[PDB]
């Protein structure tokens, strides 16, 4: 439905949608912009990520509320209320999976293959890991292990590039490590790996802060604080 709108107009409207907190619209505009077939600039990649993270974030929060209700309903002593809780949890789950599949589809056709600079390639591979991780959060069947491995593989390729091509304080590198650490802790049942990654990432960033301007220092330390927050929660 965005095929008739100019690329620049889609970008302009994505920014307006962000200001209005209309994240579904924002994501539709940015999907339209991606489907024009040109590479995305740094700002445009950030708009794409903001839009879909907010959309899926609302779905994930709703899914967790419904999953908790469903789990309580299957405890000993709980009254049978019928299929409605499961049905509605499934409805939200299916919508969430659809958004993840949409993002993964944009990455595969054709954002990743055209992304040659480290900042773009790592950004998109992190996104791929993230949306496979959100699929893993709801997966229960025979492909769960393969979904988990798809997240792991994308994160690992992003880590390998980021370590070779970016300084330890780069905000993309830091946010990637933060999310891969969460993957290890929450998805892969590897809390020690999660803690080791968060600690090493934090310490290597600390040692590189001296090279930065004030503005870059602010950007990097904000994400380092998220790593510290998780270390405090987990240890």
């Amino acid at each position: 439905a965005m095929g008739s709108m100019e690329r620049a107009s889609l970008i302009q409207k994505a920014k307006l949608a962000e200001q209005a907190e209309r994240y579904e619209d924002m994501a539709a505009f940015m999907k339209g912009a991606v489907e024009k077939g040109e590479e995305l600039s740094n700002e445009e990649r950030n708009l794409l990520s903001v839009a879909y993270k907010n959309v899926v974030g609302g779905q994930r929060a709703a899914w967790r509320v419904l999953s908790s209700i469903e789990q309580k309903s299957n405890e000993e002593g709980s009254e049978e209320k019928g299929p409605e809780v499961r049905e509605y949890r499934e409805k939200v789950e299916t919508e969430l999976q659809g958004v993840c599949d949409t993002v993964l589809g944009l990455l595969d056709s054709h954002l990743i293959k055209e992304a040659g600079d480290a900042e773009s390639r790592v950004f998109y591979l992190k996104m791929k890991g993230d949306y496979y991780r959100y699929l893993a959060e709801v997966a229960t069947g025979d492909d769960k292990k393969r979904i988990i491995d798809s997240a792991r593989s994308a994160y690992q390729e992003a880590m390998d590039i980021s370590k070779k091509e970016m300084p330890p304080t780069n905000p993309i590198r830091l946010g990637l490590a933060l999310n891969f650490s969460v993957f290890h802790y929450e998805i892969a049942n590897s809390p020690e790996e999660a803690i080791s990654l968060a600690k090493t990432t934090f310490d290597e960033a600390m040692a590189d802060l001296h090279t930065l301007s004030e503005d870059s220092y602010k950007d990097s330390t904000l994400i380092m604080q998220l790593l510290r927050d998780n270390l405090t929660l987990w240890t």
Binding site: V50, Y185, L226, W234
Partner: peptide, 8 residues
């Protein structure tokens, strides 16, 4: 406290 992942 819910663990942190990267900002949108």
């Amino acid at each position: 406290r819910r663990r942190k992942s990267c900002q949108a």
